[model samples]
Target chain A: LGSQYLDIVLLRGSSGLGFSIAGGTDNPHFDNDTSIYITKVIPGGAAEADGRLKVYDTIVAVDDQLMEDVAHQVCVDALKSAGSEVKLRVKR
Target chain B: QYLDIVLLRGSSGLGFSIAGGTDNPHFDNDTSIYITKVIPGGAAEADGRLKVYDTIVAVDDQLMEDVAHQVCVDALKSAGSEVKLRVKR
Candidate 1:
C-alpha cells in the first residue's frame, strides 16, 4: 500500500518506551533527509505488544509535538520525557 | 548516537549477521532486525561503525525499518560494492 499516516498509543514500560529512534535534522546519516524513523522496537516491550509500531516507520509527531523536522536529540528528549502513555503519529 | 558508515564489500561479503524479523520463524516474534554479529576483517568491522546489537535503520536509504529478515539481507547484498548503512547505537 502507499504511505498512510496512523496513530498509535503505547504504555511506557519500567525500562523506557520500549523502542528506539534514529535520523532527524542533525543526524549525519540522513544527510539532507530530516525525517525521524523508528529504528527498533524492543521485544517483549510496549511497542511490540501494541503490534503496530514497526521499524523504519516515520515518526510524524509525538503527542502534539511535531517531530517532522527536529534535531536528533530534541526528538529523543521529547520521547524520553513524555509521560507513561505516549501517542504517536506515524507514517508507513 | 546515529552513525553513517560506508563500507566497500570485500571478497567475503559484508561479514555481518542480522536477527529479529517476521520472515524468520524462530526469531519471528520480534519485528526489529538488528545486527547479531560482525566478523573480524569484514567490511562491517573495517568500517568501524557497526557493532553487535546495533539497529540498522537503512541501507543506502533503502529503509530497512519494517521489512522482513530476507528483505534486509537482500537490501545489503544487492547494494553492489559500496554499501552505506545508517545505524543506531
Candidate 2:
C-alpha cells in the first residue's frame, strides 16, 4: 500500500489531549497512495498475534521490500505470497 | 421495557476457504475461490480461519472450472457443514 499520513486530534474528558499515530488503511488495489492503516487492534487478531506489529506503527515494508512507494495492488499481490510467517518492516 | 431491531440491506461478499501456502515461493499457481457467506459464530470463525485475499482453486475436491463469480456464490449457498478448499499459494 502506498503510505499515507493523516493528522488527527485526541479528545480527553473535557479538553483535547495530545496527538497519536494510527496505522494504515486497507487498500486492496494500490491505486490509492494513502497507506493502509488500522483503526483498532482486535484481541487475538492477526496483527496482534504477530507481536511485532503495533497499533500506531506504519508498515514500511513486507518481506524486507519497501511497500510505501509501491502501488496498492502490487503490495497486495506481494502479500498474496504463501508462507507460515511474513516478515514486515514498520516505523513507530 | 423491550427493544426492536431492524436489518438493512447491504452489499457484501461471501466467505470462502483456500489452501495454505507451503513451499511455492513464486505462487504462480495460486487461484482464489469463493466459499460462502459469513456464518457468524460458524465453523470458519470457530476454527480461527480467514479468507482474506487468498486464492482458492477448489472446494470439497471439486475444481472451479471457469466458474463465474455468481456460480461460485450459488455453490457456496448450497454448501453446508464443513467444506474443504484447495488453495494455490
Candidate 3:
C-alpha cells in the first residue's frame, strides 16, 4: 500500500475489464472523500494493462458521463452494465 | 458531419444514454447534469465515447445548463431519431 491518493487515469474498454473497486461517499475507510475511488487493480486487468488506473484515484466520469459525487454502489452498477469500451475519468 | 464521434436519435434510436433523477445524492448539482450511468450496447456506449463520470453539456440547439434534467428525460422517450449531445468529461 502506498499513499492515500494517486494520479488520475483515463481508461476505456467495451466490456468488463478484470478488476475490483470499492469506496465512495461515506466510505468506511475513506469517509471524508465524496467520490468513489479504486481499491485495487488486478494484474493483467484492462485497467492495469492500460496503465492508467490506480488505488485511491477518484473516478470523475466514464467518458463524457461525469460521475463526480455519484454514490459508491451507483457507480459500481454502471461499470458492471457497461460494454467493452468503458471510459473512466478519475481525479488524483 | 466529419468528426471523431457523432450520435443521432434516428428511427433505430439511441441505444444507450445517461441516467436521470433518483434517490442518488452527491450526483445532482447545478452547472452540470451528472451522468450516473451508461448502459451497454446502446448508442451512447456503442458509440464508445461516453464514460461513467461524464456530464451532459448540451442537446443540439438547447443548452443543457438551460434545459433541466427532467426536460431532457422527457424528450428521451420516443420511437427513435437522430440526436447529438455535448458532454464534458
Candidate 4:
C-alpha cells in the first residue's frame, strides 16, 4: 500500500469502528520518499455507518499515547492491542 | 417511514446501491460483481472494509469473465480460496 499524508480524526462510533487501514513511512515501497493511507472501509460496518472516517483519513497516537512516525505493522498492532476504550490522536 | 427499503437490482443494469460515501454509482455486474448491499450486524455490518461501487474483478487466482461463470461460482464456494479480488473503487 502506498503511504499518504494527512491530519485525520479519531474513530468515534456507536460501537467499534470497522475499517481497513494502511500506510506508514519506512517500508521500502514507501516512506522511502513519502507516507501511508487508509485503503478500505466496509459497506454497512460501524465506521462506514457514520459520516466521518472517510477513505481519505489516516494515522497516529494510540488511545491518547502519541506514536511519532511509527511503522505500518506497528500501528496495526498498537490499535489491536488497545482494549477498554479505543482512542487515537491523529498527526498529519 | 422506515429507511430500510427493498431496492431492485440485477446482473446488468444501469443502477446502484443506497449506502453513503457514494450515492447510486452506476455499475454493470456482467463485467464484475459489485458490493451492492451490505446489511447490519456482525460481518454483514462489520467495520466496513468494502463499499458500494467497489467491483470484484478477480476471484482467488482465476480472473473473472475469463472463465465460465459457473467455475467462478465454484471457487467462491470453496473453502480457503484466498479470494483475491481485483477491485475498482
Candidate 5:
C-alpha cells in the first residue's frame, strides 16, 4: 500500500496514446472505484514508449485535474480529449 | 438539423457526457463524437439547446467530423468558459 505520485508525460501518436484504462465509476471490476487506472499499455503506444506507465497504476490526475470521485465518462473524456502531450499524475 | 450552441461553463463544468472515440467500445469504435447526455442544472441544460444523442459536428473552430475523441475533447475543454458547438440532431 506504499504508493508514490509520479508525473508522466506521454506523446500522442497517430493511433493515440497507445493504452487502455479502467477503474472508473462505471467499471465494476474495481468495485465501482472512482479513480482511474491503467488497464493495459500497448507496446507501440506512447505510454509504453515513455516507459514509465504500467498496468494497474492509479491515475491521480490528468493535466492537474483530479480524477477521484468523478464520473467514469468524465475520466474517459479527459483522457480521450487530451492533446498531443498528456500529463498524467499517477500513483504507483 | 444543424445548429450552433453556445455553452458557458459552470461550477459543475460544461455538463455533458460524450461518446464515440477511437477504440471506444461504448460507441462501437465510432470516431464521431456525440452528446450522449446533458446533466441537469448544468450549462447545456440551462441553454436548453443541447440534447441527448445529438451529434457534435464541430467544437468552436474545429470541425468534429471524423475527428479523434481527443480532438473533440480538446476542443470542448480548451474553448475556455464559452464554448460554441455546431451540432446535428
Candidate 6:
C-alpha cells in the first residue's frame, strides 16, 4: 500500500424543486442555444430520493415535453410555474 | 471629506463607485480601483451595491491620481466611523 487518491464528490443529493436553464448569448455559429446547467443540489431532496438524477445532468424534457435546443430562460420559466413534483428527463 | 479610491491591479480604464456619501468614501486596491472588502450594512451595500470584485475609478467625480495604497488606507482609517464606497461591477 503506497498511496491512494480520494475521490471527492462536489455536488450530491437533490431537492425536488424544479429549475430552468438559462439562455445562451447570440452567436452566428451556435445560434444562441442557451442550455441551463445545474449549479447546486440540496441534500435529502425529492430528486435525490428518486435515485436516477445527478448533478451536471443536461435536462432534455419535462413532463413529456421535449426541449432539445430551447433557450435557458424558457426552461427556467417553465420550472418556476410547475409548482411541485416536476418530471424531468436528463442527459448525463 | 475623506475619499477612498480602488483601482484594478493589472489593467486600466475599468472602475466604478463603491461608496458615496458625505464624509468618508473608501476605495479599493489596484489601478482600476477595485473594492476588495466593504463594511457590512454600509452605504455601498444599500444603494448601488457592488459585489466583492467591483472596480472603482473616481470618487465624488475626483479622479484618483497617483494615490498610494497606504495613503488610501490611512485616509479610510482616520476619516470617520461611517465607511462608504463607490464601486463598479
| Most lDDT-accurate candidate | 1
Deviation in Å, model 3, residue A20 alpha carbon: 22
Model no. 2, DockQ? 0.06
Candidate 6 residue runs with Cα over 4 Å from true position: A1-33, B1-89
lDDT of 6 at A69: 61
Q: Backbone clashes in each candidate structure, one number apiece?
A: 2, 18, 34, 12, 1, 27
TM-score of every candidate's chain A: 0.88, 0.50, 0.69, 0.60, 0.86, 0.54
TM-score of chain B of 4: 0.46
- Candidate 2's C-alpha runs over 4 A off are A1-33, B1-68, B71-89
Across A1-92, the per-residue lDDT of candidate 5 in tens digits comes to 45499888887777677776665554433654667777788776677778888998888898868888766567667877889888999987
Q: Judge candidate 1 against the unseen true structure and give its global Cα lDDT, from 0 to 1.
A: 0.77
lDDT of each: 0.77, 0.40, 0.56, 0.44, 0.76, 0.41
- In candidate 4, clashing pairs total 12
Error of 2 at A32 (Å): 9.6
In model 4, where do residues sit more than 4 Å from their true spots? A1-16, A28-34, B1-89
Error of 3 at B23 (Å): 12
CA-RMSD of model 2: 16.0
- Please, what are the lDDT tens digits per residue for candidate 5 over residues B1-89? 68988888999989998877654533123466777678898889888888765678988868887767887888888999999889885
Global lDDT of model 4: 0.44
Q: For model 1, how does the per-residue alpha-carbon lDDT over B20-81 read when each residue is reduced to its tens digit?
A: 66654221234667776689988888877777657788898888766888898888889999
Best by TM-score: 5
The fnat of each candidate, in order, is 0.00, 0.05, 0.00, 0.00, 0.00, 0.00
lDDT of 6 by residue, B15-86 (tens): 222222223222111234445444455444443345443444444444434455544455544434343444
Query: What is the C-alpha lDDT profile of model 3 across B9-52, one tens digit per residue?
Result: 53345655554333222211223554555666667777777655
**Candidate 4 lDDT tens digits, B1-89:** 11112222223221322211122211111234444444444232343444443555554555554344455455545514133444454
Of the pair 3 and 5, which is ahead by lDDT? Answer: 5
Ranking by TM-score: 5, 1, 3, 4, 6, 2
Better of 1 and 5 by lDDT: 1
> On residues B7-41, what C-alpha lDDT tens digit does candidate 2 reach at each position?
12123223333222232211222223522233455
- Candidate 2 DockQ category? incorrect
